[PDB]
Design a protein around this ligand. Sequence first.
Ligand SMILES: Cc1cc2nc3c(=O)[nH]c(=O)nc-3n(C[C@H](O)[C@H](O)[C@H](O)COP(=O)(O)O)c2cc1C
Ligand code: SF4
Ligand code: SF4
Ligand code: SF4
Ligand code: FES
Ligand code: FES
Ligand SMILES: [K+]
Lengths: 263, 44, 432, 214
Amino acid sequence: SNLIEVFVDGQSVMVEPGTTVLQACEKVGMQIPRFCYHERLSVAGNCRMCLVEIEKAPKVVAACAMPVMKGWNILTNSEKTKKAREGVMEFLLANHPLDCPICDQGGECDLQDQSMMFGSDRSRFLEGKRAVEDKNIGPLVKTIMTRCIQCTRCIRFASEIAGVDDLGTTGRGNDMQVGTYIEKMFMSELSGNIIDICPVGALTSKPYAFTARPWETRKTESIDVMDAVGSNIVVSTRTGEVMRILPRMHEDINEEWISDKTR
Amino acid sequence: PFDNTTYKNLQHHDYSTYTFLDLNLDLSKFRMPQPSSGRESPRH
Amino acid sequence: PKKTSFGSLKDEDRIFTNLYGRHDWRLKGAQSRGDWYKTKEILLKGPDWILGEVKTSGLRGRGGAGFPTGLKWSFMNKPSDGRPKYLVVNADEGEPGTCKDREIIRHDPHKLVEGCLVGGRAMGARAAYIYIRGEFYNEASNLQVAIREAYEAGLIGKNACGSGYDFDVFVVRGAGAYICGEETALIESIEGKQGKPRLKPPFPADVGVFGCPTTVANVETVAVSPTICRRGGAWFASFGRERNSGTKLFNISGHVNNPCTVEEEMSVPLKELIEKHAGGVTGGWDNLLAVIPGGSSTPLIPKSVCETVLMDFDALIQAQTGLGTAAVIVMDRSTDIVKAIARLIEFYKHESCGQCTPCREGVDWMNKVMARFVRGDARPAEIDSLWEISKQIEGHTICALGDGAAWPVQGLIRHFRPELEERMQQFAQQHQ
Amino acid sequence: GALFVHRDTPENNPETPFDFTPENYKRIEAIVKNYPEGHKAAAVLPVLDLAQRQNGWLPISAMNKVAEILQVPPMRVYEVATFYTMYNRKPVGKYHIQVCTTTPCMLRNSDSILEAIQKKLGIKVGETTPDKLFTLIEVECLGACVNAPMVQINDNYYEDLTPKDIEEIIDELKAGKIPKPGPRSGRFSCEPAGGLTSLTEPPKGPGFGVQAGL
Ligand SMILES: Cc1cc2nc3c(=O)[nH]c(=O)nc-3n(C[C@H](O)[C@H](O)[C@H](O)COP(=O)(O)O)c2cc1C
Ligand code: SF4
Ligand code: SF4
Ligand code: SF4
Ligand code: FES
Ligand code: FES
Ligand SMILES: [K+]
């Protein structure tokens, strides 16, 4: 009796109060593009890649943050929605370095994949790009922060999941940087999990560096034995050798995290 | 004596580094008791 | 009647009658000019009566957004739950060209303090936090002193004005950030974080400072409300056109003979405003080029539109610009119109908080492109590229600082395109 | 400084000595009692600025101390320290000159005010004289546009400047005097020059124009 009715592309879907425009779209199988939003972190709404048109409303709303109102018709493929995504992707790639061949994220990068699916196919940026200092946050996570897109996922995860308030943003405007300001190591039993939430090559696995590409690895779904939690993991192999360990989602056990000893 | 000819906001030529924060300490006795969220901070 | 001509505000109908600080700004002088008079009677009328006078007066936010204040302050007139409620006065005043709120603070501090009490009463607020930019260290100190005199006189604090209502007025100094003037970015700065706006919803009326119902209001909007209650809403609504009522504080700076803050009626012609008060455009009216009519955030207009434009919210909207803070900047014919606007985009690139992508990356992008249009180091096709970029920023950001970085660009491209294409021509022939 | 990362040096490291003076602890207590219980973090900006007023600049050990007093994670104080521009993370001169150069001040020849200071002191924008008595930076609008061109030195505004006036102001500062703030042209505040076009009549006393029913 509490569920309200909203439409996605004209199609009725019954959702409970508090459901966002992004979550109502999941119910009809439409995945809205995203960067800053992560369903297990607090909503941020800063990347702006989830902007969607609402029928009879002049202004696009952020799907990851906006609560859905009764009777709204979400236009996930209108021209206004598609021009919003195109423009946002243009700003994300304006300062992004041409690192894909040398970047470990290549081949499993959300910036790459969503640029193919929702962005333009060419550049009209004629300036010089921004460059950022590299940070040293320990021997597990390699930082190449010129690739950072300021989504703030790592900050939110470290604060809320890991309970470490050591990652933050310093500076302002275009030269806003993610880091620790001081020379500090983000040593935490869960620290390696910022490699996976980071949607780009800004945070990568130092042990894994350069050894493999995502398309050439065979995925074996298995279990972790480093402790008694039995976290569900994926073992990545290539030509008969173990390449890395990744989390596998299990809501009732480890959600989508693993410990640094498992990783 | 109605004189619309001289500047009168001249007290601010003697303010000092702690002028603002001295006053805030001086107003502290008049203020009402602040409300409480029920916990010592968000991290408690 | 319905006077179709406006201006010529008489000295008896002016609210900020100590605008120039030639009369004592302390409590003794303020009461001699009307302040703190019959405030107890106003408070005992109640919030519904107070909000009635604000609505009838048609008062609209002087902070630049220009919303109906009476409707805005009514979101706080709801039954309380467990949380306290607050009034946040926006004394940040960072908009280039704007300096009206500075005068009110250091020459009429007691009008602001009474506005806080009356306005706070209307909204059921338990205190007012007055957020004043850190650079205004002497103006904040003046206000802090006037706050002391009100406390010692029973005008604020426990049992304010003898009405049995408990109210607090706090002053909080900023630390340097134009973005903290944005209503939500101000709240986050009061709470001790970086001045980064929040997404809406929730709205501050539901979730504001400390997570409690809040209303953020400009210094000038609060400062005039007590007078609207004493003299009535109808008196205030008697000025300016319909839906554009009241007096207004105007700054006239740039290329005028006598730059000055001044009060004048809403909907006064822009030319009449400049000529009578400011002393005309430097070198005569025929030396005028373009005017930014409401601080940097608004588009510039050319000399042709400036002939018969009125200074009100709706008259400037149909001129493709906005009243903004009503900070009129004048640029005469010797000004490099491209270089003036390039420095504004540089201001925004320096103020962007970096939170959201279109403004973090886009405004910095428009700054790089404008830096080249000043030298002429580009080709004409980049003008339409810059137009499209400004539209990708506008309406896609979290807050309105992104929109205000774009509008200066759109104004320049709208009215001075031949100037841009002309300057590209010279650079090409010189270097080729 | 220009960089928003901190590298320890012999002059600025966590062991660099800082501590509030006992009067400043009294001042902090009053500051903290301005906010609801359970929201002490709201005092980060004022208390962090009180560290700068006592010491002149914010060393890493000052921010680490404000983190201890307010019990907020240090990284949340580093974020605040680097976000706002009024905080000095490098030592400045005794007198910090801040010339506004945004468009309204630029239109009224804020450039010449900047050239005079540089010639008058022998430094370029952003530098600190060998005296360690003068620092120069351009800033954004300071809220005194109608009194352009204007400069701020520490906490005071010197307005309606000309190349002569700014040279005089430094002359006093070098001499140890205390130059009077405010406009240097002839007017006192923001009224039009050469006379007033408004507020020439005496104001009306209490009770004026008050509607009925009060
Ligand atoms: C970047 C930015 C800066 C702003 N600065 C100010 C300001 O300095 N003073 C102000 O009153 N409003 C400012 N505003 C508008 C406020 O967000 C808000 O609309 C205002 O405080 C409401 O006051 P009012 O309703 O009384 O007009 C700014 C908005 C933006 C986006
Ligand atoms: S993060 Fe993605 S887009 Fe950027 S260089 Fe790496 S693979 Fe390419
Ligand atoms: S480092 Fe990665 S997760 Fe952190 S803000 Fe940058 S892109 Fe987002
Ligand atoms: S538009 Fe600019 S100032 Fe506003 S939230 Fe986005 S990045 Fe920050
Ligand atoms: S996913 Fe919504 S703004 Fe980032
Ligand atoms: S532009 Fe310099 S004080 Fe406003
Ligand atoms: K990654």
